[PDB]
Structure formats: C-alpha cells, structure tokens
Amino acid sequence: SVPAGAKCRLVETLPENMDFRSDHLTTFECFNEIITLAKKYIYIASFCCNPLSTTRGALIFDKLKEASEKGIKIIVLLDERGKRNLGELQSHCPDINFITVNIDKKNNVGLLLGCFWVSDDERCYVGNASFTGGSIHTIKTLGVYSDYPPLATDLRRRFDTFKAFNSAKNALPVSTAYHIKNPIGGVFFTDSPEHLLGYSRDLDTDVVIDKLKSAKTSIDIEHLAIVPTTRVDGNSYYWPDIYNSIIEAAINRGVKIRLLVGNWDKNDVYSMATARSLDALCVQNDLSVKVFTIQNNTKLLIVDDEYVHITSANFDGTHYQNHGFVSFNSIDKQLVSEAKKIFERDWVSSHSKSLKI
C-alpha cells in the first residue's frame, strides 16, 4: 500500500538568536542526511548559491565536496543572477557541476527559484531554504523532507525541466506523476510558471487561489508580503489575484484569517496603503495581522486545518507570473496538524508584534 503523508516530515531552520524551538528535523541535519545516504546523484536547485557565508553552510559544502570526490554526480542549478559566487564555488569543488539557468530569455523577468534537493530518486527536500549559508544557519526557513522514492522521483522530473534552460550553446517532456487530481499519499507538487507548465502539471497560481476561495473556517499565511503591487524591472505591476481571494474570504465568508508578513518600507507608498487597509479590515472583520523584522524565508499557507502549502515563492504578482518554482502541497491531517503547530508558535513569538500604523 501507500503510506499516509508520503513519508513526509517537517524541516526548518531555527537560529540560536531566535526564540523558535521545535522537535522537527533541522535543515542542517536534513542536508547532511541527503549527502550521507547519497549513492547515485545529488541534484540541488535554488536562486542564489553561497554556502560559505556561515559555519553550518560551510560544513554542508564540505560534505557535498567529499561526495563529488567519492563518485556522486552532483549538479547545482542556480539562476544566472546568483552567478556572483560562481567563481568561488568552482574553485572549491571542481567535481561539482554548476549550471547557470535563465528560464526567461524572452523578457528576462522569470527567475529560477525551485529551492529543493533530490537524491537517488528516493530522498528529497522541498522548502524555502536555499543553498546559502544563511538559509541553513542564520535565517529562519521551512520545508519538508521525504525518503519516499515515488515522491522524490516526481520532484526529480521538476529538476529535469529547469536543467534544460542552461545558458550554453543550443524535447522537454515536462512530465509529472502526481497532481491535485491524483496525489500520492495525500501529497502533490504544484509548479510555476504557466509557460513552463506543459499540459499535465498543475499551475500553483490556480491551486492556491482555489484553496483560498474554498476556505470555510481559517486561513493562516506566513509569507514575506501580501502587497498586491510588486515592482518589476523599474515599473509598478498591479496583480491583486491572491490579495482579492483572501479578503473575499474574510468579508464575504467570514473566515478568521491571520497574516504574518514582514515589515513594510516606510517610503514605499504601495506597502503603506496595503498596510493601512489591512488595519481597517481587522476592526470590522476577524482579520488579524502581525509583522516581523527578522530574516525569514518561510512561505506557509494553511486552510481549514486541512490543507497545507509550503513554497519558496511569495504571494505576489512578480513570483506567480514569471518565476519558476516547485511548491509542496499536502492534505494529510497529521502533517497539516504539525504545520498548524508551527504557525501558532510563530504567531505568538516575540519576533511577531501586532501591526501598528
């Protein structure tokens, strides 16, 4: 049979200078386990690659260096804008193959996110902890680890999609085995963007909005910002698709929504008006907003204590229209309950003060 939850367990980074405590697997322990149990390959993908920035990030880079010398095919995908440290990486690991990826060469807007590991088509990690020393040591992250072969194999097919966009000289099946119409143990992957989706994969933009509109009781979102206007290039881009489905739940359906976003800029007139209007919604409706100032890459979504959505991208226009990433989705009640515990901890954390304007 198929195990419930697809052998998935929560993984996150809790720095020492932060009051976050949990019994889940740490990101440092997760990456070290993938390298130790590696017998065939290690495929890593993220935007920026800079493990040598912290102590724990350098140890993971050393275990990965020893793996490539033992005969393990290690491929690291990184967007061509995180190419600043490329000369530093190849000088330390001549065996690890580093590949610069530009998924959007037509307009140069789409960035490579992804943020996932996969090894031997058995073990894998999916979260917002990039291959940087910060995400492993000093920055709060969140993700899921799974040693289930059928699930990690479906994630490796996502790696084959992004690998084809290497910036070198000159067929892609865009294959998937599980989606919202056929999950594996109550777990499936949503993908992005739409022009790289193919015909079988599920667009993460549609799946998130569908779960936001199908909400019945609670909506818990811990992202960096929900400001529906993000500045692409040097101009403003208005995209309230996710921002509307949330307020539609709080006003029309009376959903108790708690948003934990990062602190906004005092000079950004766009983030100012977004915040002052969320302040007015907390008075009339059951909306609650708290802000944080720490370095946190967590992108969490929980609906009705029944569905969970952990991703590396942020709920905004720039990400869900151009950026390419893989998002974790699960409806397993036992796995969602563990994610609910994480949001309750962060909501009352000392680093989460109530929104004041």
Ligand X SMILES: Cc1ccc(NS(=O)(=O)c2c(C(=O)N3CCCCCC3)c(C)n(C)c2C)c(Cl)c1
Q: Helices (DSSP H) in 149-237: which residue ranges? A: 149-163, 204-213
Interacting stretch for its own copies, rule CB under 8 A, among 110-118, 121-129, 242-250, 336-344?
A: 242-250
Q: Are the CB atoms for 170 and 176 separated by under 8 Å?
A: no
Distance of closest approach, residue 317 Cβ to its own copies, in angstroms: 10
3-state secondary structure 85-146: HHHHHHHHCCCCEEEEECCCCCCCCCCECCCEEEECCCEEEEECCCCEHHHHHHCEEEEEEE
Using CB under 8 A, which of 23, 91, 107, 238 touches its own copies?
A: 238
Q: Which two tokens stand for residue 204?
A: 């993460």
Which among 299, 303, 296, 297 has a CA at the least distance from the CA of 327? 299
Query: Can you tell me the distance from the alpha carbon of 214 to that of 47, in angstroms, rounded to the nearest whole number?
Result: 32
Using CB under 8 A, which of 244, 263, 349, 352 touches its own copies?
A: 244
Nearest to its own copies of 22, 244 (CB atom): 244
Told to check if 245 binds ligand X by CB under 6 A, we report: no
Distance of closest approach, residue 240 Cβ to its own copies, in angstroms: 6
From the list ligand X, its own copies, none, partner contacted by residue 32 (C-beta under 5 to 8 A by kind): none
- Cα→Cα distances 287→221, 240, 241, Å: 12, 18, 18
Nearest to its own copies of 27, 318 (CB atom): 318
Told to check if 273 binds ligand X by CB under 6 A, we report: yes
23 forms bridges with which residues in the sheet? Answer: none
Told to check if 261 binds ligand X by CB under 6 A, we report: no
Q: Which residues lie near its own copies (CB under 8 A)?
A: 229, 236-238, 240, 244, 247-248, 251-252, 269-270, 272-273, 276-277, 279-281, 283-285
In the complex, the residues that contact ligand X under the rule CB under 6 A are 227-229, 240, 243-244, 247, 270, 273-274, 277, 280-281
